[PDB]
Design a protein around this ligand. Structure first.
Ligand SMILES: Cc1cc2nc3c(=O)[nH]c(=O)nc-3n(C[C@H](O)[C@H](O)[C@H](O)COP(=O)(O)OP(=O)(O)OC[C@H]3O[C@@H](n4cnc5c(N)ncnc54)[C@H](O)[C@@H]3O)c2cc1C
Ligand SMILES: Cc1cc2nc3c(=O)[nH]c(=O)nc-3n(C[C@H](O)[C@H](O)[C@H](O)COP(=O)(O)OP(=O)(O)OC[C@H]3O[C@@H](n4cnc5c(N)ncnc54)[C@H](O)[C@@H]3O)c2cc1C
Ligand SMILES: Cc1ncc(C[n+]2c([C@@](C)(O)OO)sc(CCOP(=O)(O)OP(=O)(O)O)c2C)c(N)n1
Ligand SMILES: Cc1ncc(C[n+]2c([C@@](C)(O)OO)sc(CCOP(=O)(O)OP(=O)(O)O)c2C)c(N)n1
Ligand SMILES: COc1cc(OC)nc(NC(=O)NS(=O)(=O)N(C)S(C)(=O)=O)n1
Ligand SMILES: COc1cc(OC)nc(NC(=O)NS(=O)(=O)N(C)S(C)(=O)=O)n1
Ligand SMILES: [Mg+2]
Ligand SMILES: [Mg+2]
Ligand SMILES: [Mg+2]
Ligand SMILES: [Mg+2]
Ligand SMILES: [Mg+2]
Lengths: 582, 582
């Protein structure tokens, strides 16, 4: 039974209805930045004793913090901004949440309804702007529509395929007095009629029948299995099928397990891409067949019967036509198949040891490799030390670039929602704010931001947010003085012609620029720099043991390349296995 | 005090709320065509004892009838259609009502909300289709929004610059039981804040000051003066300024008056275009400066101080920048100027007899002329006889073409709303259905459809509507066996090369095809054909004296041309005064 701060017959401001609408949704943390259009909302937030606001230093850091809050907990992330410039700073976060299917609810202030369309002070048509980069958006035109729209916003953002939902609230609606009606029915008739239903037994028995008829099955797990870690693990025990995860599906099946093929795709392991290339049954659970995994669609799984399970009917058959399809929750599809695989266990006699040994041979001949040059710190080795010292139980958020791939390859994630990274949009500056949202949603957890010197500096202002909110956010900065991912593509396909990829100072060429330690010192965050490989283990241990925030500037040779690499539009026969920029 | 057919606490169907919402708006006549999506609305219409439905034989005839109902009475015209094909047949009428600023409310049925977007049976996104050809449209998503949307639809359609408003109602909303709330406030905050205000005295006194300083003033009256016939006539008495009307503003100032310059523009009189060309003060009241009047904007009123009064701020300065502007109702602007012109009458000493004599000389040397060839009926002469036999008190609706121009030139309209014609869009097949709506709104009036053989046949099916509803609609069909307007442009600018403009039968070339008399006979309408000029006066008299509907097939030589003619993009020096196709 919800206990309101107002009487059921007492009129209250629309902003007070908005905050209470969040309280009735279970919202405990918002990321709001104040402004003229949203001052009424911020005043109403102070009256709430259950909703905590984490003030960022940039609205892009506020929406990215809402993503990490959502990616690391399954709950929806709520960010609030003002009209005009405050709303336009959320654009990168909204498009990022849409491509990665992150439940998010963004509330933006707006000019009064009478001033909309008049080029008013700090007015931008944020609904027209964000319609193509959000799952759905609203423009509240009456104070009585607030309880319904907020309920519809959280329902659309969390149900089906999750995504961001923006709610634009004009200022005159926030100030208008009204008595809210919390019993209104949602006006989503076509959406609810198209919601997926529990999977039929005829579809599940046909999948189990294809498993027994197959000799080389491979599991294709992605971001749709973040809530099916137990169901997927039970499915692997009953089948013994090796698991290949996407960049979004890391942690769904433990990377340290013997049946794990780790990541597949452009920068996936050689044995994971080998398994899909020479498979006869591809179980695509919670994936969307991105070109980062398939490359050339004509050659991707060219000899496999494709079984695609997805909660979005628009994804089934988009880039590749499957043989058997199941539109619904992969969590329920696994539960239904586990019952069939257990009763009919001895009837099926499932054993793929011959196919697994074919992959174990490929795993031992082409494993993830990194070369150590003298005392220079290998970035792959540094992340491998972080795995050991944290026992693989740390929540990892990353930026975008070479460090993002090495953090995915050389860290064994035991559970999903430990791996927070921008995969669909690939937005730099995501690592640091996402670690803020993850640390708030998981206070007793080890949160480490494996960031790059280019991605870290984009939202470096959020270091002040970490200090003020006293969050134990660790920053494992892999500094290579370059935009490493773009630098790698210059060495491979452009004759190493540098085109504005060096991030240091050309005057003092051999000086670490910028001095990231002074960035942490400016915000009162203890920091240290490590350059020699021998001092690396003690430095990372000091970062973890030191209470509160900590930044570790790890210097790495910039000539390193992420391996292996399948060029864009290439096949498995075009995989690059060796080479760098020396 | 409105008396409902339902108790204030009695639930009723949404369709019954829709009809009662029309009753509360004063609606007495609708033009509805039944269909699967709108059957609930038609069932609710039979329960209404005050709303009469005129069933057309084509939805395009239904919306055109709603236009004539609106153009001839000032009331809004209401047409109803079903989803899919019924709604798409209203498109030509909606775009026609928008360009001519006709108050219109179109109600279309729609598939249930759960089926929208699923390519359902008889589903078309009529809101997406008609958004650019309507003033505003709605998609009712809840039964409780019906009383508000209908009130907003009639308010937007009739206030400010009138226009068509479409209301899409899904079938499940029509069937849902609810208790309507007729006290809801309209959600039009930005529209009402931008509504024009009464004109200030400083703007009106500056206009009167320019009148006394001018020596060659010309009134530029258009469709915005349809409700200011008395105010405009009072303004002319106090100033003595000659009046030049547009195709839409005919009747605002009597054509038979000595101070009337008749119509101006491409097919306007030579003396009306001469007055604007050699004027020093142009009083543009209720016009939009169409290229059919200006031609080449650089030479249109090149020596005149332009005073533009318009209720739409977007029209002031669009195609030509004025010196003095007044944004508001021209009815109030005339009332304010009449008070200044009467008190300061002897102070101003207004007299433009020298400028009027300069125009009277041009009027006598270049009047509207037509040539009579033997006993062949001149189409200009036939309309001139209709003026005499009806004393100029008949409501005239026309199609589009040569007959439309001759009906505008050779008929003296005493009051506005006697002249119903498609000017902005220029849609053929408008004359016959518009006469239906005018005859219903004005039962005791003489309604005559001056139609062309091409325009009349497009909506010839509405002859059945005239007979069933027993409407005294007269059809003065000027039959020239050709698409005369397109034929005229072939003779002038294409060496008389006929390109599918002959409407008769090439096998029987000298036979009147089709036999329009049998079209009227099929619908039980008395008809007759007149070919000799001597029998023309008795034939038109028989049409008027015969009670009920009547069709008069007037045969005219097709070689006639509408004169004078200013070519597209031309100036006053390029006016064509003589010539035809012989
Ligand atoms: C520099 C860089 C390099 C990259 N390289 C790689 C790479 O080498 N390999 C790689 O894999 N990625 C890589 N990516 C990431 C990438 O572009 C995509 O995010 C990824 O390839 C696709 O993730 P996904 O297949 O799991 O689909 P997601 O984006 O995770 O979407 C989930 C899918 O499952 C479905 N789904 C969601 N919920 C459910 C449910 N409850 N039940 C059933 N289905 C559900 C959704 O409809 C959707 O189709 C890289 C990104 C960057 C920035
Ligand atoms: C074959 C053909 C030939 C044509 N040739 C000619 C021609 O020779 N001459 C000619 O004039 N037309 C001709 N037209 C008609 C034409 O294209 C336009 O409809 C016409 O030229 C413009 O009419 P209007 O200036 O009165 O503006 P309208 O279309 O009548 O609009 C009214 C204007 O007044 C304003 N207004 C409305 N209500 C009010 C109010 N209460 N107070 C103040 N302002 C108000 C509106 O904002 C709008 O700007 C022809 C049409 C056809 C089909
Ligand atoms: C907001 C934004 N701007 C530009 C981007 C284009 N990209 C990249 C990519 C993969 O998206 O190329 O398509 S990666 C990259 C450079 C990475 O700098 P680093 O943080 O130092 O990481 P590293 O460990 O050194 O490699 C750029 C400039 C981007 N994604 N986001
Ligand atoms: C729905 C529609 N289709 C085609 C049209 C293009 N036009 C015309 C025009 C001016 O719009 O040319 O731009 S006029 C015209 C032919 C008029 O046939 P009539 O009825 O016989 O009249 P008349 O007394 O003989 O001259 C055509 C074909 C039109 N306006 N509406
Ligand atoms: C807090 O700092 C400021 C500064 C400032 O100008 C200097 N104005 C305001 N307040 C408003 O502007 N109110 S308003 O007129 O309703 N708006 C258009 S809005 C919705 O807020 O964008 N706050
Ligand atoms: C009257 O003639 C018909 C014919 C016909 O098919 C032969 N079906 C119906 N009725 C419906 O179709 N109802 S419905 O399913 O809700 N619709 C999709 S709708 C809103 O009406 O388009 N009426
Ligand atoms: Mg499909
Ligand atoms: Mg870098
Ligand atoms: Mg203007
Ligand atoms: Mg027809
Ligand atoms: Mg004709």
């Amino acid at each position: 039974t919800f206990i309101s701060r107002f009487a059921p017959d007492q009129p209250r401001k629309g902003a007070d209805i908005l905050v209470e609408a969040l309280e009735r949704q279970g919202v405990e943390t918002v990321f709001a930045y104040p402004g003229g259009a949203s001052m009424e909302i911020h005043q109403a937030l102070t009256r709430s004793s259950s909703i905590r606001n984490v003030l960022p230093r940039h609205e892009q850091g506020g929406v990215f913090a809402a993503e990490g809050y959502a990616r690391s907990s399954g709950k929806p992330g709520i960010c609030i901004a003002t009209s005009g410039p405050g709303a336009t700073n959320l654009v990168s976060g909204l498009a990022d949440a849409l491509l990665d299917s992150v439940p998010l609810v963004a509330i933006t202030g707006q000019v009064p309804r009478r001033m909309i369309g008049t080029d008013a002070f700090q007015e931008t048509p944020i609904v027209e702007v964000t319609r193509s980069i959000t799952k759905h958006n609203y423009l509240v035109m009456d104070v009585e529509d607030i309880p319904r729209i907020i309920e519809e916003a959280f329902f659309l953002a969390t149900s089906g395929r999750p995504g961001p939902v923006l709610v634009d609230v004009p200022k005159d609606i926030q100030q208008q007095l009204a008595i809210p009606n919390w019993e209104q029915a949602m006006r989503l008739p076509g959406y609810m009629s198209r919601m997926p239903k529990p999977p039929e037994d005829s579809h599940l028995e046909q999948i189990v029948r294809l498993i027994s008829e197959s000799k080389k099955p491979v599991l294709y797990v992605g971001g749709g299995c973040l809530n099916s870690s137990d169901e997927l693990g039970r499915f692997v025990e009953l089948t013994g099928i090796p698991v290949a995860s996407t960049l979004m599906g890391l942690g769904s099946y433990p990377c340290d397990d013997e049946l794990s093929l780790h990541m597949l795709g452009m920068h996936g392991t050689v044995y994971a891409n080998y398994a899909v290339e020479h498979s006869d049954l591809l179980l695509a659970f919670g994936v969307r067949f991105d070109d980062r995994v398939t490359g050339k669609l004509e050659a991707f799984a060219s000899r496999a019967k494709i079984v695609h399970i997805d909660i979005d009917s628009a994804e089934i058959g988009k880039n590749k036509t499957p043989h058997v399809s199941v539109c619904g929750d992969v969590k329920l599809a696994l539960q239904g198949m586990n019952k069939v695989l257990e009763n009919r266990a001895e009837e099926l006699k499932l054993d793929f040891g011959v196919w697994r040994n074919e992959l174990n041979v490929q795993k031992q001949k082409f494993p993830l490799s990194f070369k150590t040059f003298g005392e220079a710190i290998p970035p792959q080795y540094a992340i491998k030390v972080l795995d050991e010292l944290t026992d693989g139980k740390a929540i990892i958020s990353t930026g975008v670039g070479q460090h993002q791939m090495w953090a995915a390859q050389f860290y064994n994630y035991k559970k999903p929602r430990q791996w927070l990274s921008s995969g669909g949009l690939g937005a730099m500056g995501f690592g640091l704010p996402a670690a803020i949202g993850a640390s708030v949603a998981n206070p007793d957890a080890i949160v480490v931001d494996i960031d790059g010197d280019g991605s870290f500096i984009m939202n470096v202002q959020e270091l002040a947010t970490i200090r003020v909110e006293n969050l134990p956010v660790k920053v494992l900065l892999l500094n290579n003085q370059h935009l490493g991912m773009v630098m790698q593509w210059e060495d491979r396909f452009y004759k190493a012609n540098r085109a504005h990829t060096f991030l240091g100072d050309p005057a003092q060429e051999d000086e670490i620029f910028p001095n990231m330690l002074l960035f942490a010192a400016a915000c009162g965050i203890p920091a240290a720099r490590v350059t020699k490989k021998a001092d690396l283990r003690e430095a990372i241990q000091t970062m973890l043991d030191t209470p509160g925030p900590y930044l570790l500037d790890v210097i790495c040779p910039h000539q390193e390349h992420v391996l292996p690499m399948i060029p864009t539009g290439g096949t498995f026969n075009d995989v690059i296995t060796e080479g760098d920029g020396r």
